[model samples]
Target chain A: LPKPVLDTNGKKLNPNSSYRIISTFWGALGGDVYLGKSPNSDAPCPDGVFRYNSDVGPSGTPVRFIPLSGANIFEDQLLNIQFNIPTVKLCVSYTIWKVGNINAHLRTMLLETGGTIGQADSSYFKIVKSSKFGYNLLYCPLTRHFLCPFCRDDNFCAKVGVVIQNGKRRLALVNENPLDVLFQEVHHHHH
Target chain B: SPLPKPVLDTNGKKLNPNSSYRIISTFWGALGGDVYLGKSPNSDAPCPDGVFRYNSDVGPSGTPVRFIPLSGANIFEDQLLNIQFNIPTVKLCVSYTIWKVGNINAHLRTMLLETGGTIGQADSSYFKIVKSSKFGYNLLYCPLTRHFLCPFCRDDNFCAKVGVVIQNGKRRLALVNENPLDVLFQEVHHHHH
Candidate 1:
């Protein structure tokens, strides 16, 4: 059985909970940047369609983690995020985009309601403890032990980073610059 | 990945296009007696009106099911399929619609419905009539129909199941991946109304 994941409060994160995920990457724009949903290619979708773009915005939108086993949310195990669309799990879209001459599947994170999740591996992401205190996210799809590694030069790295595509900063697996992210538990009392 | 094999019937015959057939189950047959696909009695059960449910209304005494393949001339296993049926007279096609699983727990996401008569186009466009390993075939729902890359529709062939999820009351068919209903397609001679 997988163990429960610890929150920023150092407490075992409770099941059926939601939290604000903030990235401490030098606060980029000198403001505390946090994960927020914005319109992607499928924008103007009455809020159902979105992509995670951390910006200088309030940590208002929180995300919930649902485990694959439908039980405890474990550390470094497979799970999905509950964002704009509760039913559609957050996943790296199979659609490709170019960043310079390098034409790679953008691995853009998006959601859809369909006869799908066919790309189940890409939909899976894990969380591990940070060297300091917070937590780091990882996408170790069953396909590759190499495409998902700590950080290396060759057969090697896939760090969670941002790519500015069509003016929107998208969350994706980049060759360098992994996002330093931490999960802030939202004690909403109710909402 | 292997190319889809032709879907042969109990008679080892190829299923005809625009032809009527009755879908039957093999595994759970002898145990609980055989059950086939039929329609809700207009408003008898929780599944709104016009939804398909598993009963013993074997068709074409008339075949209730009619396969409309989007491609090839013949039906094959493991490919996206389009199945059409009726409770006939008030005929409908199959597609998935969202249903809430638990109010506080989570949602059921999708429930197979007789969307609209138009190719049964609803949330998803196709259902795969897959050949199961041991007994018969499994109706699968996978919406990886399109990709940004060339040749488009990557045919990820990835899918869950077009099984049963009883909503409100009746056993309305939906994409319940865990316990898929294993079935066998039975061909029938055309019967006129």
Candidate 2:
């Protein structure tokens, strides 16, 4: 028998339709050219006008965009961009391609491009902090109290990032300039 | 050595339009220099006068070596002066060089020839150019950013996130926007001397 004539009709495999069931072999033949329509979630944006914006996770502090310096050689390396979702869970994601081929060339390239000494390499890593929102738990007036981040003169309210440039360490908050701070109320442990 | 032009006002007379005279020395301390008034080789502007003023913005504690009053007539009229200096010359050879013969609009020098006319000290319109590194002078710095802070307009407080960009042998600040409306937060250098 040369090749088995397998019946693949009525399956979720319509070339022009929205649904897709691609053949792995066929895709590999044309350099993995998969013809298919993405589900609504894939776009994550339905109306096009309404875009997806991530809220600040817990334990995150607000920051402002500022001028950066001391980096050498490589150009256009985006270290971080901060927003006000009022939590420490500051999420970060790099398009994998900016550094190099995601599958085969991410680890070393990220380390080299990001840096290591004090935080050169760490700067390249995606570090998401918790939200830093919420009123002081201990300051109820009726009960003289103290809080962690919300408390005055606390560094938690000013979480900063460090990246390695050249061979020196550089610091910055996860924000642009005029960093409007926000807080997130979480009921987790205060440790 | 080059040949000197004929001094028209040899007897210390008012400026003459025809005679080709090169300035030998100006009399004011920290605010004077030799004048160069002649037809520019590049343009038709004849009797072009270029005055070079010298002064220091660094206070009495710091060395007095900066020069001001860069090229062009009435250059200091707009409350702006072209101050030039090297970043690490240690003892400043000449901090800045102010150039201008006389004001064109007011028809007078931007600064008073004598009297309360002082440059490189406490004046709102005056800003000092300090030595930043071995490369060039650090024109300005803001306490907010701490490192060579970019200056924005006084009215709008919109700051750009950026790093230093070295191009054309001049290191300028660069922004991070995917498409930046303004590549550089430009500031003007005006002479008071």
Candidate 3:
């Protein structure tokens, strides 16, 4: 459970350091995109947006990993995004998907997060080795302290993938073909 | 047309018993939060491997449900579905267990997942998929409507929507007069593992 998750450079992910989540699904030809919350600050739980125009990634932001309960960080940790404006950091969580067009029916959506954060095995995440490109990020929260004794022991963890909704690629917790990614350590400029 | 409209697939085609479809709830987004087979606390009679969100598979893909059409049912109208999730076990038919209003519980008649071929499903399993006044379609056990040799004769609970109730650390599918799980049938593109 405490395996050291290597970054794109094969170096161990630093607990105190910040890293940028870059998707490897597009490979070389398709331009690189990153994982970050939508720009709308007022929205409590903004749709997770990918950085396209800016080279610095998602509105030029970076993310950090924090443990669900303890101080130590591991491969699978809660992803936290530090926005362009300081003191406005937020943790990433998923949302229930709704297919606006299909009979007004709601699709099973997995989006950004916030709230009581209980019964949320979906909130916690893990970055593990998958290929030479980098690692695969999966949602596997470990929680049993407060849940019922009859509950399942294995966390409902799966690799996060993207589905085309309204022509925009949105992050969803998918069962197959998870979005392959590489965690690039975002180095601060020496001003 | 004199016949009732058939339940359409994700591709707008009539549902056949040969094919399997993913029955999803419009309310609960799938994150191990869809309809699936669940085992009771004690594998006793009445309901053993019941269907629910609690104590079920902790994954996104919901259990693929198959239709067991009635005689001369053709491809139109409500179908008698085998709620079993491709399990070879006894979890096949979807029925109900009456809980008396004062018997340690209120007027709650929860859905029971009984062993098929054993329990008499003729009086219980007539699961219908009628269009909802709101959106999409709803699940109904309409045996009372058939007016045949049946159960629930006096305190008639017919054409009731397949509802849910929380009890004994279980999210039970119960028969309620109103407010049922609104659902849609999407043809399972692939067999969910």
Q: Please name the candidate that would achieve the greatest lDDT relative to the true structure.
A: 3
For residues A27-110, write the lDDT of model 1, one tens digit per residue. 333122222233332421122212334232222234556566657777777665543111111221211111121324554443
Residue lDDT tens for model 3, B112-150: 433332122454355667777776677776554345554
**Better by TM-score, candidate 3 or 1:** 3
Please give the distance, in angstroms, between residue B84's alpha carbon in candidate 1 and its true position after superposition: 0.5
Whichever of 1 and 3 has more DockQ, that candidate is: 3
Whole-model lDDT for model 1 versus the true structure? 0.46
For each predicted model, how many residue pairs clash, with residues at least 3 apart or on different chains? 7, 61, 6
Candidate 3 docking DockQ? 0.02
Q: In model 2, what lDDT does residue B6 have?
A: 21
- Top TM-score prediction, candidate number: 3
lDDT of 1 by residue, B42-111 (tens): 3333222233443322110112366767576788886655665422111111221111111121354665
TM-score of chain B of 2: 0.18
- Candidate 2 local lDDT, A131-189, one digit each (tens): 33211101011111234545554422222222232332222222322111212111111
lDDT of 2 by residue, B27-98 (tens): 233322222111112222211122222121110001111223222232212122332211111112121122
Instruction: Write the residue-wise lDDT of candidate 3 on A1-191 in tens digits.
Output: 57777776777776566565665544232223333343322444333534333121111124555555565555655543221111112322322111111212235444453422323433556666665566766765444534654587655666766665444455566647676666666542211
CAPRI verdict (incorrect, acceptable, medium, high) for model 3: incorrect
